[PDB]
Chains A and B, each alone.
With several copies, the nearest count.
Chain A
Amino acid sequence: KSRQLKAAYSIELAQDLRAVHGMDADAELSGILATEIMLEINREVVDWINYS
C-alpha cells in the first residue's frame, strides 16, 4: 500500500526564510516530509502490533 506527501511551498516563503535565518526552506521540507513518512510507518507497525 502507498503513502505520499506534498508541500509545494511558495516563493515568498522561501525568500523570507533566506532573509530571516539563512534558510533555503525547500530541503527543510524535504526533511520534514520524509521524516513524517518514516515516523508514520514506524507508528503504523507499532499500532498493528497492538491491533493484533
Chain B
Amino acid sequence: MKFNVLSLFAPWAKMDERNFKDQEKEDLVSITAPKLDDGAREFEVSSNEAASPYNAAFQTIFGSYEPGMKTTRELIDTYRNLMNNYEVDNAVSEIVSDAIVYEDDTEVVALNLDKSKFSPKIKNMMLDEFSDVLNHLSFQRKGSDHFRRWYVDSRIFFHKIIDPKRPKEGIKELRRLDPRQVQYVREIITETEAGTKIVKGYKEYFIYDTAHESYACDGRMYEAGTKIKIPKAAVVYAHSGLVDCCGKNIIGYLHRAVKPANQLKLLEDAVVIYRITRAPDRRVWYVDTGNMPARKAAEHMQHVMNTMKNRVVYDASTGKIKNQQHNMSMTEDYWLQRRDGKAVTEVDTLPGADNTGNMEDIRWFRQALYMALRVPLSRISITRDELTFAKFIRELQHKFEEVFLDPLKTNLLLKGIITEDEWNDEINNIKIEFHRDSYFAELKEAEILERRINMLTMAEPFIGKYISHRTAMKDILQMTDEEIEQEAKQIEEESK
C-alpha cells in the first residue's frame, strides 16, 4: 500500500529525497515555531518519522489544504472576474506591459553575470542555458502573458520534465499549470517534548488534481477521485508576498481592488438603471364599472382602453417612432367617459426618470478604484508617482524572476555543470536584468543632466578658487574618480 509517485516523476522525487536527506542532518533544531515565512501551507501530522507513503501523505496533504482550497479557487475566479471588467484590465495592462517589454532589435530580459567565478566558461554556459530557459517558457513571445496571469493570481506553476533514462539532457519546454488544480503543503511528522522542535524538512508536497471538477465557466467534468502527489523539484513556481490574515492564504495583486471594483460596478449600474426605469410617460387608466364582475366589467374597460390605445413603439435601429401617423399630433388628446354623474373615473399618473444629478459619487468611487488598482494616477516628466511605480515594477520583477532562476539553477545541476553547493555559496547575486524603455530612460537622464549642467554653470565664477574640478565632477556631475580620470585622459587624446 506504500505507493510511490508515478514513475515519470521519480527522478524529481529522487532529487528531493537527497535534498531532504541532507536537510534532516542540519542543525536547525530546537525551534519552537516552524522555520517558515511563505509559500506552501504547513500542517502538524502523525509524528511518525518517515512514514510518508502515497496514501498517508494524501490524507494529511488533503486535510491540510482542504479547509480553504475552495476559497483559493474562489479567489482565482474573483481576480479573473475583475480582470474581465473594464477599468481594471487596463491597470493590469499598464503594469504587465511595463514589467515586461520586448523591443525593436533589442535584447530581452537577461541574466547578468558580473561576479567572480572559477572559470569564465561558466558565464557562457549559464548564459547559454538561460537563453534556453526562455525558450522553454517561450518568454520571447508569451513572457508577458505568463506574467499577467501570475500577477492577477499572485502565483504561477510549471511542470518540469526529464528523459527519464538520460535525465541530464531531458530538459525541455515547461508546461504552465493553472493553480485551480494545484495544492502545496509543508508537513511535520516528528515529535519531542511539548511539541516538535526537531529539524523539519516538511517535504514541500504538491498535489495535482485530476478531473476538471471545479470550474469558472461551464463544460465541467465528473468527480476527480484520487489526486497525484508531486515532488517540488518538479515544479517551477513563483508567487507574491501578499497573503491574507491567516496561514498561507495567498492573495492577488488586485485583491485590494475587489471591494471597490465590484462597488463601482454596482454604482455604475445603479446610474444606468435609474435613468432608464421610468424614462417614458407612466400612468394607470381607471374605468368605473358598477355592478359587474371582472369577467364582464372588462368589456367596459376594453371600450375605452382599446379605443384610446396609442399603439406606439420606438425603432432603436433607426431613431423613429415606428409607423407613426400622422407624424406628430399637436396634443395627446385623450378622453374618459363617466357613466355616473360623479368625478371618479380618472388617470393615475407616475413620475419619470428626471435628470437631477449631481452625478458626483460615481467619480469619488471611480477615483478610489482607479487608485486601488495600482497608480500612477497620471493616466486617464519624472515625478514621485513614476519613481515609486518603477520601484514596484522591480519588486514584481524580482518575484516573477524565480521562474527563470529555478529551471536555470536546476538545469545547470541536472546537466552536471555547477554543484548545488557551489551555486549556494557563490550567489550572492544571479540577477536577471530587464530591458527598459529607452524613450523614457533617455528623457530621465537628459533632464537630470540639464540640472547638473546648469549647476556646473553656477559653480563656474567661483570654481577657480572655491571648488576643485574633481569636486565639481563628483558632486555635480556625480562622476566616479575613475570616470573622471578616464575623461581627462580622453580629453587630452581628443586634441588630435
Contacts and interface: CB of A to CB of B under 8 A. Distances in A.
Contact of A35 (B220, B222, B224): B224
A45 interface: no
B223 interface: yes
A34 B224 contact: yes
A30 B220 CA distance: 11
A39 B248 CA distance: 34
Contacts of A27: 220, 222
Nearest to A38: B224
A34 B211 CA distance: 15
A14 B220 CA distance: 16
B380 to A, nearest CB: 42
Contacts of B222: 27, 30
8 contacts: A27-B220, A27-B222, A30-B222, A31-B224, A34-B223, A34-B224, A35-B224, A38-B224
Interface pairs A-B: 6 shortest CB-CB: A34-B224, A38-B224, A35-B224, A27-B220, A34-B223, A31-B224
Interface in A20-50: 27, 30-31, 34-35, 38
A35 to B, nearest CB: 6
Interface residues of B, number: 4
Contacts of A35: 224
Which residue, of B220, B222, B224, has the highest number of chain A Cβ atoms within 10 A? B224
Interface string B215-228: 00000101110000
B218 to A, nearest CB: 15
A27 B224 CA distance: 11
Contacts of B223: 34
Interface in B254-297: none
A30 to B, nearest CB: 8
Interface in B201-235: 220, 222-224
A48 B474 CA distance: 85
A35 B223 CA distance: 10
A31 B211 CA distance: 14
Contacts of A31: 224
Contacts of B220: 27
A10 B180 CA distance: 31
A31 B220 CA distance: 12
A24 B222 CA distance: 14
Interface in B404-462: none
B66 to A, nearest CB: 12
A34 to B, nearest CB: 4
A30 B222 CA distance: 9
Given A27-B220, A31-B224, 6 more contacts: A27-B222, A30-B222, A34-B223, A34-B224, A35-B224, A38-B224
B328 to A, nearest CB: 55
Nearest to B223: A34
Nearest to B224: A34
Contacts of A30: 222
Nearest to A33: B224
A9 B222 CA distance: 19
Nearest to A26: B220
A35 B225 CA distance: 9
A18 to B, nearest CB: 14
A19 B220 CA distance: 20
A25 to B, nearest CB: 13
A11 B37 CA distance: 41
Contacts of A34: 223-224
A45 B220 CA distance: 31
A35 B222 CA distance: 13
A21 to B, nearest CB: 14
A34 B220 CA distance: 15
A14 to B, nearest CB: 14
Nearest to A30: B222
A27 B223 CA distance: 10
Contacts of B224: 31, 34-35, 38
A34 B221 CA distance: 13
B68 to A, nearest CB: 16
A11 B199 CA distance: 46
A32 to B, nearest CB: 10
Nearest to A32: B224
A3 B220 CA distance: 24
Nearest to A34: B224
A18 B220 CA distance: 16
A12 B377 CA distance: 53
B211 to A, nearest CB: 12
Nearest to A31: B224
A35 B333 CA distance: 72
A30 B211 CA distance: 15
A31 B222 CA distance: 9
B70 to A, nearest CB: 11
A51 B372 CA distance: 69
A6 B222 CA distance: 18
A7 to B, nearest CB: 15
A38 B224 CA distance: 9
Nearest to A24: B220
